[PDB]
RNA sequence: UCGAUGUCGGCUCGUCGCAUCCUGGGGCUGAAGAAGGUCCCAAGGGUUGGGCUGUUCGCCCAUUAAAGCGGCACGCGAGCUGGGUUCAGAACGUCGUGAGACAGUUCGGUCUCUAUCCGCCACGGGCGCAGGAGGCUUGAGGGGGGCUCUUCCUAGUACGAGAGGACCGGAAGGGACGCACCUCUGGUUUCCCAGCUGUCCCUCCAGGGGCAUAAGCUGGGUAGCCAUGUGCGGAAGGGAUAACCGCUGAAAGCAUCUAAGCGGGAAGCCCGCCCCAAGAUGAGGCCUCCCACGGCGUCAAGCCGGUAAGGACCCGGGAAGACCACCCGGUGGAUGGGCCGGGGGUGUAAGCGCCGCGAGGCGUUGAGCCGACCGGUCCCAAUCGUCCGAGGUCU
RNA sequence: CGAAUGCCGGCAUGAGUAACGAUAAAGAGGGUGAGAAUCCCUCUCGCCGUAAGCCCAAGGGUUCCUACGCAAUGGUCGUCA
RNA sequence: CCGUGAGGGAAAGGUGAAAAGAACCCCGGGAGGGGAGUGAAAUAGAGCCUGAAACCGUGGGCUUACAAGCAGUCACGGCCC
């Protein structure tokens, strides 16, 4: 449940380190964003050169998440943070790279080339 | 004494009426067999007691 | 309007084609029909059905044999089922294939002397900031001199639930004649135990 | 009417007898994963155990994992696209059934947290039992 | 809706706990106390558990009442001449009865409690 | 209105108006398509989260289908706030010789436990419903609810000066909101289990208890109550219309949706759905029960006294509940309590054996303890009883 | 005299309502007596312990001890003070 | 009684000619009653002559649970003496 001001680890050699959501773009007024769902959110802190400075303004997308995510058959699966992958306006990443896993809803949201660059899917 | 304060006293007529449900219930009660006496249900009482069972003082 | 009494006894969750699908069973034991309501004298139709069956022959007034399976009439009563009229003698769980579509009817449970911000969500006041008894309060109820009075209906406190509720369009996923049971797709109205009424649905 | 219960009971015929046992110990099992057209593939998952949460039927249990720099926790039913859940190490030999400090404070501090359990392992030795007399006893 | 749950309580956790017991030393002392009901009815089961644990007659049990009562004589009554009493009868090794009038004082209902024998 | 009508804004709670910001109709268009513009009909439902200022308002950030404008004592302080305004203290700039003064600034500054009437939300008592009962019902009439976006298929095909992209029809996803639910997920779980410190005590060791909160502290945690969790809902469908579009058609040889008639046509009206509902004194219906004058007035209660079917009281209780009410039991009984089994929580008790100098560690042992959950069992307790209550008015 | 938020007095209404003055905490068995949750005794439980324990100043002025009492006082009760 | 003090400053009359002030019995712990008794009188019984009103009761008549009110008034009709 990431909701604005909440502060997301970026998963990418995008070059930002954190971004901090301002806000989800699901509907009017959709209150959390988890896995798959896009948002908007402003860079916090960065690495010194790269595609995202500081005070940029980007949309990523949600990619693990802290409060667990229910699935069809029962079972469940939380990270230990929530990251987010960092996307240009049409919806690609922008990024070459992406650390540590991800979870499979964003295979169902279309975001394929994501989910061929981690390193495993759970 | 502040804020809220009745109006106007209030009639004997609308008092009286108020208390039409304050009249009381007469006690429930019963015969004690084995013993002449009237106590409520459910109830070892100084009259007799009971039969097997304890009560005051019997001979 | 197929319809039969019976028991919400709980839930749990089965799986389907690969995926969890929480169910609240309930015991449709065989309903005997014990009156049948005419247009002709009653007004209207419908089949008054009956349910739990033991009783210490407690049957007074309503001895009521009058109809073949009196049976000694039903513990938990016995409840019409408005437009239906069918094989009369008994009404079985057969009545239903899995796949269906049923309105469920019940009890809410009984919540007591609510506070409104829980009888309605109301907002409550704020934990801190401002003074210090109006935290679970519901705030202004009113203008002032007009219309200088409270409106019929306002969302306020008092007894809430223990009342009717109907809930609507539930997935039959199956069920066992073998035991008169029969599960739904779960959340349905009052306690385990408890009476209820489930009936085709209304998407037709 | 009688037993509420044994009549729900009787609902869950899709109980399991075939997963070894375990608790908070180290266990690792499969899947079932959909994707690509198909609902193959399966898939291992691989951890401490964490936490089961008795319950007959629906008993769930939850499994710790290290993926890249993160951590996982997995959430299971113990039913039904479970293929296999043959177990690693049944160590722990915890002092205690809930075991959600090892979050805050994993890595090696785990291992010597979490010794082994050569009780569970040695009777694990005993159900080697793989003698093979069959058509021959 | 507080009340979906099990056993009645007036007074706080430590206290609360405090009359159990002083209850309980009390009925098997004298065989015969005399309370307000709830009281009465609550101290039942209170009692037929420790009674319960001294027919077994280990050293565990012995230990195992000795939290609630704290009395060595008193536990040894209830293990050697209290709970032989029992032994043919599971379950129930207390009665309650109440009285008639209450106390010019406060109108309280009592009732009284017995060892049952 | 000065023997007092608290006087901005904020919050909370709403309700209304339409001159409509979305959403539904529609006519003109300088309307190719798409997207606008403009006017007409239409509030049913909606109308976001932030930065700045006490602000109203406004500008700005990011969204959005949209980010409407007003009334309700600039709605709402016996509901809250008191930031501003608005007492006494202090300062600046300024005016006055001064004392002091300024909708000019600045820092600070007491907002009252008890509701009598009306109103409103809940729940009962009485009586009536023209014999007396126990059930099941009909629904006059109320209330609730009414939302909306995206992606795809038709088709990149009608249309195109191309550089985009439909109508109609068909599918699959979302967002808020509403009613219910505890299987899952996630909380609490005040004594269910374990561990810890200090001290006093029981009994010296071991083993326990008190207090460190109204849980000493810590780590877990059933039932229940719950949202972050789950299932459902808005509908389909019918009817009458609005602006608007037509058929046939005179008065008026032509023309005209109209004067006679007839068709289309809105998220709007009515019905359909969910809940209340016969105090609907207009007190309704159906099923089933009990029926007799026994003794006295002016002759059917306006009569008492026993009754009948039934119903109270008293008692055990309940996911019912402030009390009341409701529901279920009362020995023909499993209603609570106890006990037993199953679930479940804790996570290998004490004691003994062994190992180590010892702190400890192993084994016995998934032990021991163990609220509510699903059940079983007459061991304990619902003993024994009483009081009500038709005897049935007229053509 | 009918009004002066009149003056003295008595008696209403709110009302069997708010309250009964520290959330340190109670329980049982015996006595006593017309009557006891409230008095005496005992045993369990809790609270204070640079005190809520002990001793002195000031202030108060018989509140001290004992025997009788229970109308009133004691925020209930009272056999206790 | 109030106030350190100067000072402020109430309320509260009435048995009957005579106390003849109610022995004794009864209920009650007493307080209070009921009989007896005194008296011309005891609804003269002790803050007791007279004993108004507010206010609170008990009994009796008429009357009210589909009507809306400055409470009265005018008219009819019913029931009661």
Redesign the interface.
Known sequence: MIQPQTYLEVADNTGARKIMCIRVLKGSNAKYATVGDVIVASVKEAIPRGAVKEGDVVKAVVV?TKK?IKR??????????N?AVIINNQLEPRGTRV???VA?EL?EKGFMKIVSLA??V? | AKHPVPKKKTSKARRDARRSHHALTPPTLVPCPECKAMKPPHTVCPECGYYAGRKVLEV | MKGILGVKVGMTRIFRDDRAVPVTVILAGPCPVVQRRTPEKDGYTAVQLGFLPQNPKRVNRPLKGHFAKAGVEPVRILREIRDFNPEGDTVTVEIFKPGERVDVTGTSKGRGFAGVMKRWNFAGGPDSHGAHKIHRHPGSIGNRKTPGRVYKGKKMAGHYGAERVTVMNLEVVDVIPEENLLLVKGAVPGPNGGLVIVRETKKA | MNRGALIKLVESRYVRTDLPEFRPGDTVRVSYKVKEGNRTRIQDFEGIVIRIRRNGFNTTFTVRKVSYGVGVERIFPLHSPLIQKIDIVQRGRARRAKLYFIRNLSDREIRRKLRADRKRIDQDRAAERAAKEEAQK | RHLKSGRKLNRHSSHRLALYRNQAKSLLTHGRITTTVPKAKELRGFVDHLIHLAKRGDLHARRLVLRDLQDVKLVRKLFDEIAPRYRDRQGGYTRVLKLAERRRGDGAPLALVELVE
Do not use: K, N, V
Request: glycine share 10%.
């Open positions: 693990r667990e069809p058959d029962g079972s469940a699966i939380r990270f230990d943070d990251a650390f540590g896993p499979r295979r390193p495993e759970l």
